[PDB]
Write a protein that binds this DNA or RNA. Structure first.
Length: 116
RNA sequence: AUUAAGACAUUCGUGAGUGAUUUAUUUCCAUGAAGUGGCGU
């Protein structure tokens, strides 16, 4: 189990920028630009081992929590470009156009493009 | 023994009768029980 948490208590949640609109049995994928506040933000990872054991024949429950392995940490590695930081440059329109144009003998996400 | 003597400004009398601390005034305005899956590449 990898627990993800903001390095400082500044980011707690993020709604999916994409919105799915189902009208008259038709699927519409819509979206504005993402919230730029999440870009270039630090994130902290806490690894935890959970070994679901055999039932104790009395509770049949889980107490398999008291394990945690200490792996290596790479904070500020490569001048704060590592798996603790967000890509600091992203446009939802560009990625959405890149998707549903990726294909092999046919385009994967079978949606045509009425975009504004 | 002298134009003198005698004489309570006194008796009766409730500061009382009628009189709502009352007329009027919204414990309201704001806010998503909501965010998110992942491994099985």
């Amino acid at each position: 189990i990898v627990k993800i948490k903001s390095a400082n208590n500044c980011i707690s949640r993020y709604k999916s920028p994409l919105l799915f609109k189902i009208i008259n049995n038709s699927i519409y994928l819509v979206g504005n630009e993402i919230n730029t506040e999440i870009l270039n933000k630090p994130f902290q990872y806490s690894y935890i081992e959970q070994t679901k054991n055999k039932n104790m024949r009395t509770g049949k429950s889980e107490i398999t929590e008291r394990t945690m392995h200490i792996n290596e940490i790479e904070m500020n590695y490569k001048n704060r470009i590592n798996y603790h930081y967000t890509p600091t440059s992203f446009s939802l329109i560009d990625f959405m156009q890149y998707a549903m144009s990726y294909k092999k003998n046919g385009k994967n996400i079978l949606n045509y493009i009425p975009l504004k």
